[PDB]
Amino acid sequence: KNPKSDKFKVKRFHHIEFWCGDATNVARRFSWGLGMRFSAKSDLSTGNMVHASYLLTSGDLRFLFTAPYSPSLSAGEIKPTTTASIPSFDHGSCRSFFSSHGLGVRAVAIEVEDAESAFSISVANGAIPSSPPIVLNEAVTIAEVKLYGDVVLRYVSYKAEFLPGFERVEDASSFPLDYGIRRLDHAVGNVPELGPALTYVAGFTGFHQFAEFESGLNSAVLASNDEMVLLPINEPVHGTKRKSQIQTYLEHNEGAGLQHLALMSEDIFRTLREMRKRSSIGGFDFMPSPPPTYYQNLKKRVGDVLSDDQIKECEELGILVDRDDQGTLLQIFTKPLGDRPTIFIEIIQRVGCMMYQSGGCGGFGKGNFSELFKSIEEYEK
Amino acid sequence: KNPKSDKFKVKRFHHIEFWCGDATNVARRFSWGLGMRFSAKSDLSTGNMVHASYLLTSGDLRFLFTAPYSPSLSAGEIKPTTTASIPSFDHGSCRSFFSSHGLGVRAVAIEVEDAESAFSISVANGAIPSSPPIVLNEAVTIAEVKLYGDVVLRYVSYKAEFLPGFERVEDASSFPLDYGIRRLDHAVGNVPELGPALTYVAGFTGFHQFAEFESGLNSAVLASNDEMVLLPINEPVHGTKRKSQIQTYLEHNEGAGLQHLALMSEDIFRTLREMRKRSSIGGFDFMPSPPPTYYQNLKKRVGDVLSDDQIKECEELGILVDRDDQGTLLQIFTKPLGDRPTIFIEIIQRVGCMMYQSGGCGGFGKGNFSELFKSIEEYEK
Ligand SMILES: CCCn1c(=O)c2c(C)c(C(=O)C3=C(O)CCCC3=O)ccc2n(C)c1=O
Ligand SMILES: CCCn1c(=O)c2c(C)c(C(=O)C3=C(O)CCCC3=O)ccc2n(C)c1=O
Ligand SMILES: [Co+2]
Ligand SMILES: [Co+2]
């Protein structure tokens, strides 16, 4: 069921913005680890005396890394005279966010038809405003409302290159890395209580629940009209034997925030070979692999979609597989991206549901909670 | 002239500690960029609920990256019950340092025979104490006094593995990178006034001035008895046409701090090939190269030490060369390590002064200020 109840026209995921203490070092680590190119910048070299912002791209995926400068550099500016390229940026907010949460996502940005319209409708329907709409160079409109914790949902609309005031990167410094990642598939929040959070977000977006198919989580997924913008939310299940990983997140994060970003690859096998090659030389580590029992059990579950060779390939790389009614999902998770056990990344590829491919095809892998436990205990034998 | 006036027995540079917001991402960037191995850790996985600290090694060079956790994780601890592996660490101090300075060096650590003795003598002779001596596991003694700005000089003595409470890195995660860097040659501070700073530091160490051989700097070098611990200090020269790079540092750093770390390599040619290979894929960028006139002028200056082929090699890699009375120095500088134009790294190799090789052999390259200007203007032609 899809009531298609979006309250404003929503296009696609546009970008993700991390708030950090040093944008240079985080951006350079991510570039090498994930194979994303340096595409644009707004820093001192471009006249921005307020914040250092660096943009990484892979296909249509945009990761923006931003950090503050000393406020003394821009102490004489006022908002009408600012040199910031992101008018919503605030020194105090950024330092407070990062000291409270450590490294993580500040903005989930989606492209809309009319950022001004989306903002007003949103707050008309209960959104807590964060940054009012601003028109950049008469060409781009940007606005922000609260999503959960200190994460904002950013609207971005274009009348007709990333943002005004950003310069393209002189390719000499812009090495064309590419491990196969292509777009952002979904962005997941952790909250203490799922009910009030879902009611708030679906309330002002009109997004509908996507509908799915003991391990410490309850969760639900909001979706836009064509189900291409996907925003799942988790809450802790307390009192179980094994401590909830959602509760651990809220503890070490100082409350709600974004849990994982799921990046779609055009060839998950090559993405995972390339990332694993780099895990120990500046890249990302992956969660411990499932036991061979898990892969011996895959023939019965997806032996009609993946060849026996394609299953052995999953086993070498530690990929997980799940399946709903309409298609199949290959997935794998990184260890946390930073010091704290909080944000992590998921790499995914979806098989099926062709009309183009419809969003959510195969679900989100909840069936791998039980299957992982099962295969672990079979292998304990 | 060497009066050998050290007021306590001083051995060698022991380590450098960076204070950052996310130790994981900075450490991983440095590892790949400089070819340093992950050697030890003290974090949540080792029972440290206070700070995440990761140690990188290359030969005898030790880079320690440290970041705070949420104070709520250790809110019930007191100093007698602390889980920190570095007793001098303080949450407030670390967050205040990094928000004020961005990424940079907090501690310059030297190994002494008696850290307790060195501390008392130092403050007896004018050192401002920072952290009193603490004995770790009855095996290591650590103490800290102020050096300049918010940089401390850390004393470390061993009765007889980095520090108690640090675990060796399970080599699976400890890839053995090595680009040829071997030890820390010198560590350089920027201050507004050189006179008062030198008087303070030589005052409590007994270190002597090392003695050298318009571009915006005045500087002097303090040295220990065998001249192996080397601590140069710069001050701005104001009112010149081209703005002083020392003044720019103090502006963007919010005052005094460490300017550069000079790492000695056993083969600067291979170190620079390896680092340059990585500049655009997560490593470090190097300052713009000198013009061909500079290298055509090298035959007359060091044609008795470097072959014509060894000079062409310098030209490919952008290495600079200087020479004093006793030996020759090859050097090159990175662009800043972070967002702000503040800290940078120097790679160096020294030729000459054999007895082992005496420290400071060839000076520090001040003769390259004029030679760079000269060759630039000849090449303007
Ligand atoms: C330490 C790794 C633990 N772990 C996960 O974290 C994990 C995640 C995070 C997902 C996931 O992506 C997801 C959604 O996107 C929608 C909300 C529900 C949900 O969980 C799916 C499976 C997972 N499995 C199997 C697992 O074992
Ligand atoms: C943007 C690069 C600008 N630049 C330097 O920064 C530079 C430095 C930093 C050194 C140096 O190491 C040093 C000492 O170690 C002792 C104190 C004096 C001193 O300066 C030497 C030469 C340099 N030259 C030539 C240069 O052009
Ligand atoms: Co997911
Ligand atoms: Co130097």
UniProtKB/Swiss-Prot annotation, chains A, B:
InterPro entries: 4OHPhenylPyrv_dOase, 4OHPhenylPyrv_dOase_C, 4OHPhenylPyrv_dOase_N, Glyas_Bleomycin-R_OHBP_Dase, Glyas_Fos-R_dOase_dom, VOC. Gene3D superfamilies: 2,3-Dihydroxybiphenyl 1,2-Dioxygenase, domain 1. Pathway: Amino-acid degradation; L-phenylalanine degradation; acetoacetate and fumarate from L-phenylalanine: step 3/6; Cofactor biosynthesis; prenylquinone biosynthesis. It is found in: Cytoplasm. It comes from the Eukaryota. CDD domains: HPPD_C_like, HPPD_N_like. It catalyses: 3-(4-hydroxyphenyl)pyruvate + O2 = homogentisate + CO2. Keywords: Cytoplasm, Dioxygenase, Iron, Metal-binding, Oxidoreductase, Phenylalanine catabolism, Repeat, Tyrosine catabolism. Residues 12-158, 183-335 form the VOC domain. GO terms for molecular function: 4-hydroxyphenylpyruvate dioxygenase activity; identical protein binding; iron ion binding. Its cofactor is Fe cation. Its EC number is 1.13.11.27. Binds 1 Fe cation per subunit. GO terms for biological process: L-phenylalanine catabolic process; tyrosine catabolic process. Fe cation binds at residues 186, 260, 346. PROSITE patterns: VOC (PS51819). The keyword Mitochondrion does not apply. One of its GO terms (cellular component) is cytoplasm. Homodimer. Belongs to the 4HPPD family. PANTHER family: 4-HYDROXYPHENYLPYRUVATE DIOXYGENASE. Catalyzes the conversion of 4-hydroxyphenylpyruvic acid to homogentisic acid, one of the steps in tyrosine catabolism. This is 4-hydroxyphenylpyruvate dioxygenase. It comes from Arabidopsis thaliana.
